[PDB]
Amino acid sequence: GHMEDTYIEVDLENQHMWYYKDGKVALETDIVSGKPTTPTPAGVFYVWNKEEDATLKGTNDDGTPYESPVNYWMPIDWTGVGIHDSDWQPEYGGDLWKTRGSHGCINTPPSVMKELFGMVEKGTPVLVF
């Protein structure tokens, strides 16, 4: 519940990523995003690329590059934020990010991210809040 657009959605607080269409959700899963050291931004996001069997990366809180071996990636920012499937990171829900260490990236379930990536492609926004 955040705007009326068709997009993807994410709630950091309740660690839940949706797909909004028709002002309604097409998709909804639990996630884990934005660990305390490198938290998620929240605002108005849009996927500018589709990455499949992709490898996410990033500069840690330290400025140390890392990776996220993903199967479905949908980057929305140029820091390395977006929606992804997280198989290495099998948990999703109430604040996991704090421990589970996602760097602004939203840990969507590999199976549900397939639903999502399955709905959403570039052009579509994403949300986090």
Cβ neighbourhood burial of 41 (10 Å; 0-12, 13-18, 19+): middle
Number of separate domains in the chain:
1
Instruction: Say if CB 7 and CB 121 are below 8 A apart.
Output: no
Backbone dihedral angles phi then psi of residue 110, each to the nearest 5 degrees: -55, -30
Backbone angles phi, psi at 14, to 5 degrees: -105, 10
Active-site residues: which are they? 84, 105
Domain region containing 78: 1-129
Report the alpha-carbon distance of residue 99 to residue 117 in Å, rounded. 26
Would you report the helix, strand and coil content of the chain in percent, each value rounded to 5? 10, 35, 55
Nearest residue to 50 (alpha-carbon basis) of 84, 4, 92, 10: 84
CATH number at residue 92: 2.40.440.10
